[PDB]
């Protein structure tokens, strides 16, 4: 059910598609020096985004899994109402989740969306808990480092703060007021190639 979208995501991604997403994503990260204001993802929809990473603005870009919360979801590009109604959404104006110093890639999700758990339970995460991210050919592993509460107008607090490589989860807080944003930061640990036989135990644990 969840596993079906993931399997289709995966199987369709040839080596040529994957290398093209790699290079488009690098390009996108390179243009961010130029941009400025990150927009609050829980406005609303979202201004006007053109990632130019895929020909289809609504393609699934990655899959994200946090086993300890039984979360396994597609990640879309650009965090508007439409995408956040269908899964998790990368926040425009933050890097895509690639390797390198000083990357803080921000993925948003709903707290109490009428029909899906999504990020309802991020507040349960303890330091060390694992998050696995699948870009098609690799699974990147992160581990929970710390959390913050911020105000929605405090968009600067979404930017990188260190030379670390980070994935930051953002959702609304507290229920039902939602007038704040919960941030949960994760640090990158390792990248597994799905061509490596050890990768199979990561895939099994993360995506099933």
- CA 119/CA 103 separation, integer angstroms: 22
Separation between Cα atoms, residue 197 and residue 86, nearest integer Å: 32
CA dihedral 137, 143, 149, 152 (to 10 degrees): -10
Q: Give dist(CA 102, CA 120) in Å, integer.
A: 28
Q: Sort 141 into a burial class: Cβ within 10 Å, 0-12 / 13-18 / 19+.
A: middle
Sign, CA dihedral 87-93-99-103, equals negative
What CATH number does the domain located at 1-208 have? 2.40.260.10
> Active-site positions?
110, 172
Residue 133: closest CA among 166, 160, 159: 166
Tokens of 188: 């990158």
Method used experimentally? X-ray
Domain boundaries, the chain: 1-208
Handedness of CA 187, 190, 192, 197 (dihedral sign): negative
The beta strands (E) that lie in 11-164 are given as 62-66, 71-77, 88-90, 103-108, 130-134, 138-150
CB atoms within 10 A of CB 55: 6
Both tokens of 39, joined, read: 């927009």
């Amino acid at each position: 059910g969840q596993v079906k979208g993931h399997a289709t995501f995966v199987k369709s991604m040839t080596t040529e598609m994957y290398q093209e997403q790699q290079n488009h994503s690098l390009a996108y990260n390179q243009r961010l020096a130029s941009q400025n204001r990150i927009v609050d993802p829980f406005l609303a929809e979202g201004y006007e985004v053109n990632y130019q990473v895929s020909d289809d603005p609504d393609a699934v870009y990655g899959y994200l899994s946090i086993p300890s919360l039984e979360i396994m979801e597609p990640v879309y590009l650009g965090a508007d109402y439409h995408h956040l109604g269908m899964g998790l959404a990368h926040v425009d104006g933050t890097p895509l989740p690639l390797d390198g110093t000083g990357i803080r890639s921000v993925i948003a999700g709903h707290r109490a969306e009428p029909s899906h758990v999504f990020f309802r339970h991020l507040d349960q995460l303890k330091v060390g808990d694992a998050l696995y991210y699948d870009n098609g050919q690799e699974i990147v592993e992160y581990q929970m480092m710390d959390t913050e509460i911020i105000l929605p107008s405090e968009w600067e607090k979404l930017e990188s703060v260190s030379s670390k490589n980070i994935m930051t989860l953002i959702t609304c807080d507290p229920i039902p007021t939602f007038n704040k944003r919960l941030l949960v930061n994760f640090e990158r640990v390792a990248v597994y190639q799905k061509s490596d036989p050890q990768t199979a135990a990561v895939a099994r644990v993360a995506f099933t």
